[PDB]
Amino acid sequence: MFNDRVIVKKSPLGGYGVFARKSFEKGELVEECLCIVRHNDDWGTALEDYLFSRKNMSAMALGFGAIFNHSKDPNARHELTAGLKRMRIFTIKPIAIGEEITISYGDDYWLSRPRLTQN
Amino acid sequence: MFNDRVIVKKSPLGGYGVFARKSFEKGELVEECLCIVRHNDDWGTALEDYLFSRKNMSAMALGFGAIFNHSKDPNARHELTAGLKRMRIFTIKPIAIGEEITISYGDDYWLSRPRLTQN
Amino acid sequence: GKAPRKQLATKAARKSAPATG
Amino acid sequence: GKAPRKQLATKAARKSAPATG
Ligand SMILES: Nc1ncnc2c1ncn2[C@@H]1O[C@H](CSCC[C@H](N)C(=O)O)[C@@H](O)[C@H]1O
Ligand SMILES: Nc1ncnc2c1ncn2[C@@H]1O[C@H](CSCC[C@H](N)C(=O)O)[C@@H](O)[C@H]1O
Numbered sequence A, B: 001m002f003n004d005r006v007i008v009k010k011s012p013l014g015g016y017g018v019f020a021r022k023s024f025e026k027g028e029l030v031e032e033c034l035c036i037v038r039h040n041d042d043w044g045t046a047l048e049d050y051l052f053s054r055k056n057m058s059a060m061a062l063g064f065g066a067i068f069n070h071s072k073d074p075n076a077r078h079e080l081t082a083g084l085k086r087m088r089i090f091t092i093k094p095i096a097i098g099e100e101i102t103i104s105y106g107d108d109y110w111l112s113r114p115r116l117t118q119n
Numbered sequence C, D: 001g002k003a004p005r006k007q008l009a010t011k012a013a014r015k016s017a018p019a020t021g
Helices: A042-046 B042-046
Strands: A018-019 A031-036 A036-038 A051-053 A057-060 A086-089 A097-100 B016-018 B031-034 B034-036 B051-054 B055-058 B088-090 B099-101
Touching: A042 A051, A042 B042, B031 B051
Parallel strands: none
Antiparallel strands: A018 A097, A031 A086, A036 A057, A051 A057, B016 B099, B031 B088, B034 B055, B051 B055
8 A cells, every 4th residue: 555656545634545755757657557448337337436437438447546536736647558458647747745646537527616717 | 566575467477467576474465455345246247357255245356356366376365354345465475586476266266177185 | 407407328427538538 | 967057056256265264
């Protein structure tokens, strides 16, 4: 769970997101794991919670792809190889020691307050 | 994926099991991750592949609990907290640098040649 | 609510992607 | 094969456990 590069929290003031002990720059692979690629139907139902679905199907977050919560300024994201198989976690915008690593969602998965626009 | 303690293979002569770069002793937590606890039915079906089920239900291998292949002399195993929630990976019998970490199955999940007995 | 509502949806996804709308 | 076969099974599990038969 804990790693010299980051740690899992379970934080003093955070839900279940990741903590960036670093120390990362713009474009740093913080971590990477495998995932599952299944179609909707019973899959989307039974796994209705931590499923990273793309425009074609719904996959599962094998590594720590689910723990990533939704933040207004996520300083870290992830990448996907050809399909929803290999999942990576880069650092969109350098991070400082003591930050929280998380990722956004997209059209689906709503956040809360529509305050992410300057228009 | 790769870690100073172990690595994922994808090996020069191994399927998709884990590699023990260490260097471990008898009773060493090589790694630990979370898992999912769901009942049989559609769950056992859609996830019919890497499901660590106990005597009461069927759970999913969140961390690298599935990659563990079946070997005749697995020098590493795993542990389970109260229920199929937290999963750990200890080292049943010290391991040398350049070994393969894997785990057995049990009554279900058959291996191949019944050559695991001296009677 | 006093309007055409659509429960079912062919484009019903879950988590967006890194860069694939 | 020339014997009582049982396809369904109430004790149908998947992967055994570390120490729980
Ligand atoms: N900024 C936010 N505001 C409200 N709810 C949020 C939120 N960020 C996350 N959540 C909720 O939490 C869910 C994300 S799953 C959270 C990750 C979880 N800790 C894990 O380990 O899997 C979403 O469905 C969302 O409703
Ligand atoms: N010793 C062995 N002989 C034959 N098949 C084996 C085997 N060890 C593993 N397998 C097969 O592989 C399956 C285990 S799943 C293998 C782990 C996979 N690399 C992963 O990442 O999830 C079993 O269903 C079994 O049929």
